[PDB]
């Protein structure tokens, strides 16, 4: 027998298992520096898009620019002699 | 040539298999037996089996005998 139908919260076993009560266990010495470093980007579509538009541009940038390419047909690549078929 | 001749055979295959599908979507939806009573479309539906049965003979004839010869030759 269980019931307490007045509460459907305890009938579902939905209880959060490993969630604790304890408040912040973290030091104020390092608190006040990060807590103000996170909200510089708080916003939905004007920031996530910065990651797509501005963030993914290093594929563009250092894919073309920096000469660290390894065996890339981009840059170093073909430098050796080209293969010719039997017929032509 | 090879890369072509095969292209236009396959791309011709799919198009016919779609010619019959929309042939079915026709009959399943926008065909009307009333206004078509006695037409040429209704005469075909009047004998379904004859068409179905004879294609079933020709496809079996070629089935046994064409395979039956390759196996005999093997």
């Amino acid at each position: 027998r269980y019931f307490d139908l007045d509460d459907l919260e305890n009938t579902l076993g939905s209880w959060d298992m490993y969630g604790q009560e304890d408040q912040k266990r973290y030091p104020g010495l390092q608190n006040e520096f990060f807590e103000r470093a996170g909200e510089s980007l708080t916003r939905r579509e004007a920031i996530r898009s910065v990651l797509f538009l501005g963030g993914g541009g290093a594929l563009l940038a250092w894919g073309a620019k920096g000469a660290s390419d390894v065996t890339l047909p981009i840059t170093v690549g073909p430098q050796k002699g080209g293969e010719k078929g039997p017929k032509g | 040539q090879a890369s072509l001749y095969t292209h236009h055979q396959y791309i011709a295959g799919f198009m016919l298999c779609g010619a019959f599908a929309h042939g079915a979507i026709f009959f399943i939806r926008d065909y009307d037996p009333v206004a078509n009573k006695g037409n040429v479309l209704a005469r075909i539906l009047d004998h379904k089996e004859a068409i179905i049965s004879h294609l079933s003979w020709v496809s079996l004839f070629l089935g046994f005998h064409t395979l039956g010869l390759y196996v005999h030759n093997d």
Partner: protein, 155 residues
Amino acid sequence: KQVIQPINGDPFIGMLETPVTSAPIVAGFLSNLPAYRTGVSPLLRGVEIGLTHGFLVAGPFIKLGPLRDAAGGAAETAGCLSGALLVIILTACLTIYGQATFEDDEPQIGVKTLSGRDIARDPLQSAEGWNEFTSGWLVGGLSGVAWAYLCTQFL
């Protein structure tokens, strides 16, 4: 006696408690993690959680990357840069999961503790609590790879 029981009374709930579910150790450990606590800001978790996952992800790249031979330490930065991408990619994923599940208007859907007590729902549910976490993840995620590099060229 019998060691194994259904979770906390009712047998008809899906899971049932076992030594890796309800124990002295496992109850405490999984609860100590910067995950389940209800008493710390979500911004502070991302700067914790993401801070770790940058360091350990660098390793595979900075060790077994495409280019594992360089005389300038470039084999190490080639992994740092790419390991810094899964930092930048997952930020897109994290933030995306916020605009989907959580509506700014809808309240926190988290449930209430383990036993008898209803304690204030997970401060991270809605987009506000979530987005503060995402930027937090991005703050730490950059550090983890960074200190991984510093630990590569030093220490």
